[PDB]
Amino acid sequence: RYIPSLPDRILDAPEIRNDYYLNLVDWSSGNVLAVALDNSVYLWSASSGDILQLLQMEQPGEYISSVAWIKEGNYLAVGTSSAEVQLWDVQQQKRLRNMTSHSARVGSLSWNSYILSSGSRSGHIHHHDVRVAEHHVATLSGHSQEVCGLRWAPDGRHLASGGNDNLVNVWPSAPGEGGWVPLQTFTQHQGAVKAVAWCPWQSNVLATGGGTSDRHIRIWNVCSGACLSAVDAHSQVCSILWSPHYKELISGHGFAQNQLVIWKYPTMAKVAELKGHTSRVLSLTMSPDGATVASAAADETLRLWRCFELD
């Protein structure tokens, strides 16, 4: 099939924080990209090109460490270096909540309906019921280093977390009659696990990717614990996304090519490489229609690749 070698758009990302553990971009279901640039969050509306500076941190030294849109795309969660998880109403351009519970920066976020999960440099994960006064309703403690990858499954049955302690934990959706203990703890990656993404068409299938000392993409069945595939990507794997339309995966990388790689699933054959970034890719996010992948990189650009469409 034909995949374009050039991105559809190249957006300037001046002062993007070149910190591997942060999750600074997210594309909403309303087709709006949220981009954290140092101490500000900018919103770019894909259909119009309109840009809004949603917010700016008020204290010296403060920076944004994560952003995640709620499913409906009307609220944006913003994790900060000052251990805050802010909830912003983007229609009103106003902060609704400034939730404190963490002891260190919140570099990862993931929503499950009205529950927002947040991962911290402390290694703890907190569940926040954003609708209520005492938002902090659960603490999941399965990491000894920064939680850099955090992702609820699309069916809400599991939550995956990856850390700078080289672990992947798969958590249940509720503590039930027992406590908050992982259903699975995968120790096979020999590096930080920032890349965490669930297969959209198979409930229990998860893809994870390790850092520079690991370089592998691993596919798991979280029910059986099976490692279905382990492929060497020859670089750190910052992100992974699945195309639900093409049955493919796309991963972002660092040294030496700073490229995106498209893989055919389930064969894991290399389909294409998207080159152009001049410094390591930091994060990937997908458009709500599944056609475009935005890659944010340490070269201060956001490249938007229409790699899953011909129109």
Added chain:
Amino acid sequence: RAPXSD
């Protein structure tokens, strides 16, 4: 340098 500009 304008943030998010083309």
